[PDB]
Symmetry: C5
Subunit: 269 residues, 5 copies
């Protein structure tokens, strides 16, 4: 598809907003531990690793239908171009809480250890599903069958197997520990991610309504929404909550998006 100039004039710009709730494993809003994974079930050995589905954080994704733009026989057509995005992880302050049931910081007179450890933050804005690459810590892990993971895993999948590809086309089904953004593709999506590992690492997060991210590429072109559909994807693992018993649950937070779009001329394919 040959991309042409930006369409000017009145009504050329639009704005959408949305939020994606986290998918840490308890993914139904009636779940007692909604926003958390179930207690981590640890592998007995390399050969015997069977994580429960509810213990595995997955990517969130939503598809937004935009206003129809196009006569599909005219020489040029228009597409929605995502220009910029304001995005924020919501409910950061809920972590500022030392009375929750948990493990004591010192003895039984102290507060409880707050959520900490490994964090993973990612958002993407694209005109189609985020393209994914498969890679696991262990090729001998047996994943739950109703989740989307790598078929016919071999040791190569502990590194880069160019056959292990997928599209993020379902909310709450693609394990973060299996899939990551494919940098060899995603020509039509901008994605942004940061990771800090560790068992007990302090989480660090910002929040403001003053920051915007521009989505335009080196040529001045943002993601173009095929079939007038905008794709928002995210994961926001903000750490691990430990219970008194010492069992542990991933903690995630929801993400807000506010995307500005304009109208972009393309040559009819």
């Amino acid at each position: 598809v040959e991309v042409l100039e930006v369409r000017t004039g009145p009504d050329a710009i639009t704005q959408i907003e949305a939020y994606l709730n986290p998918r840490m494993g308890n993914n139904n809003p009636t779940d007692e531990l909604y926003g958390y994974s179930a207690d981590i079930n640890v592998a007995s050995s390399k050969a015997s690793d069977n994580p429960n589905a509810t213990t595995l954080p997955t990517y969130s994704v939503a598809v937004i239908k935009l206003p129809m733009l196009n006569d599909m026989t005219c020489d040029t057509l228009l597409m929605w171009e995502a220009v910029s995005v304001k995005t924020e992880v919501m409910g950061i302050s809920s972590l500022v809480n030392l009375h929750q049931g948990g493990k004591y910081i010192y003895g039984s007179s102290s507060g409880t250890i707050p959520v900490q450890g490994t964090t993973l933050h990612m958002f993407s804005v694209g005109g189609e599903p985020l393209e994914l690459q498969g890679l696991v810590a262990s090729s001998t892990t047996t994943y739950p069958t109703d989740m989307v993971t790598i078929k016919n895993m071999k040791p190569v999948n502990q590194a880069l197997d160019p056959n292990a590809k997928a599209l993020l086309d379902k909310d709450g089904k693609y394990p973060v520990e299996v899939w990551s953004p494919d940098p060899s593709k995603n020509e039509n999506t901008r994605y942004y991610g940061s990771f800090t590992g560790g068992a007990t690492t302090p989480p660090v997060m910002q929040f403001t309504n003053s920051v915007t991210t521009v989505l335009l590429d080196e040529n001045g072109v943002g993601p173009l929404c095929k079939g007038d559909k905008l794709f928002l994807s995210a994961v926001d693992i903000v750490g691990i909550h430990t219970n008194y018993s010492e069992s542990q649950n991933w903690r995630g937070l929801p993400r807000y998006f506010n995307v500005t779009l304009r109208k972009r001329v393309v040559k009819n394919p």
Copy 2:
């Protein structure tokens, strides 16, 4: 309301200043532990979680009345105060530089005591109306004190985004930080700025200077517009946790200073 151009000429600018004391739990200037929470009381179980009001840090809010601008509300165009920029500062930072305070020893009984440390939260906002808030909690089965403003009729959904859990920050020392946070879906007429570092024992990090200004104009060059000539300042500045010798623990907060520059903005009379 349609926003027009900046009003130029003499006396088009004004400047205000204010401080906000922290609301950590002991919120009365006579309280022995003013500027701290009461000893954290830990939930016995998920089902039975009743934090005392005095153990829950809340937001600080102050409303500042600005000079009256409009003589005749029938004119085609009207003026509003526009917040353009703020200098802001957490005060008393060096009060944490203190190893003789009562507490838990760093090593044995010959050493100094462990200074304030652990989870920190800093936020300020400047707005032309109350900061709009979104409700979200660590646990939906916590029972909050009824003399505070918390999410009505909580369900497990409230551990994530429930779009019906919305509030306004309209009272000082009443809205707990562990329940409410700024709503990025609204707040078109406020600017907020926040940072969080967690952990049980993390060292606090803070800066102080009179050389730094934050500009409040949005992408259209328009700052917050003060509805009814009212400027809303909001803040929380939790600088960590102090541990007592008994190992009981208290949140510590510090005051925040504001210096806001404002200018007159023409609007189209909405009636």
Copy 3:
């Protein structure tokens, strides 16, 4: 006082340099522990908290006298020295790179000893008058030593902001840092810069170079203006805590160098 333009010409610029020694508690050059506080004496209880003067770090402050500018004090306009920029350095940083000093072993008795670490506080200021202070303390029941300048008749309000608790940094080694901080509601005529990192055992981090200048001009392009041709330089550089083998502890401070560039500013006579 109405500020006018900068004065041009030859000899319109001057430059001064000075150093300020740390005031950690042992403030006399002949003290065995000069540059350190005395062993921290801890409160038995909140109501029983009597920190020795020698255990409390205080601000350093120097007044530099500048060439007189107005031989005739009745002219319709007067000149003032305007502080334009400063290069400043915390000296002797590498003295901390030392694992043999008497103290607490890192591991067992075969290993090096724990270096200076924990809470750091760095501040400098340059003004044409004394730094303006706001008092605020961790505990309003602490009894401070009388030979120091602290908040008069403390009440619980002083654990937060009491607008009556103000002071001027006008004496070297007398204003404790745990009591006073720079007052952001004043200090129109001073530039100050601070950085704090807490913790019991935090690694300190410091840089040193002669390539970096801080510009002191405000948003109207005006620096601090030196009243009575006097320049005020203030500082504190607490670089951490040294722990002794007995587990007693001392604050460790380092000196600060200032190199200040000043120009002649015109002002209308009041």
Copy 4:
């Protein structure tokens, strides 16, 4: 060779993409622990230090063949491919977000297991010939496996800079990172970028995005020139250490992606 101007016009630009798999020690894709080292085997003494080849992470290198540019090597000028910019990404970062893997418990046997952490090393390079390396080791009495490429006949001088200990990164998975580092006295025709964080148990930190480009041009506007139409891509990405339940330890590495943009550069025919 004398470097002239950039050749303009249609078809003057190309781009290539490639990925490099990590060489942590288990370097054969059929290895059960591919993408990890074997269990680290520790020296019994300084004199007795024989690390297994499979426990030693090595540099990854690939050579990308570029389209032949010159139809007649007799002309006064010829064309070379010039690497202008690169997008590069460490893939599978999120595979580390895994608390269920067999290993050492964070707390007791009810908790998750400790994830990969400790020393990290990341490096990428784009050049028009092999990366030039300098040898330097932690201990000169270590006996390295003979089928790896290491320093010949080491002496204690090799625990610092011996100007004779030089090599070319011209083999994949053969040059140990603990023996070789990029040589800053050479590599005129390569650009390299590296970052290291040590420590026994440090949390790893990594970013990923498709919005970031690195420009490869030097201060004269010239990027790496590809000799014999070959582009050399080199990397190492050690993300830390995995600890087993037995407390044995394995290095963990991740693959790296490269997307390089090149253009045609005119040179004078030697």
Copy 5:
């Protein structure tokens, strides 16, 4: 000396490169522990702190002779080499990525050993004369090895700033870092750059690239001017501490490379 304009024309620029090996205490290339200090010997008491010379890291320094510039030294103006920019690199950073070296186990005897960590100190300078130094120590009652250069007649004042405690870095591996640091009140003709992170066990952080240049020109656009056609390069790069199985400890350092670009600068002849 009055400095005039830059001299143009061909052949007005030159480049040099050099490397400085670390002087950590074992400073002879045939020393078994070259590139390390000897096991730290700790003070028994403040009054008897007698550190062995081989335990004490010192500054590296090299002088580079540049091409001679003035035939006739009776001309009203002369040329000096002016250092304009430097590319510098700490070499061998990846040798630290090594967990099989004899040492202290991370966990038990099945695990790797703890790598180099703790206090780091990085400094480089480029100047047209010796680096000017200021003296300051942790304790004036330490007795330093006589064959090193330290502060003569130390008194307690030397635990802070004594304006008489001055030296020049004119000898390689003789001036202890724990005694001497760059004197910011002098060094008008040298650019130095330093960073320090303390602590016992701190993870070291280091970057390496060939893409970064530091410009050495001052505020008036003048770099270091080379007196008698001599260029002085100085450095220390302590990357932390290696711990042995026994728990004895040794400082670890790495070499530094320099690539400096020089141009010809006109000066007025002082006759």
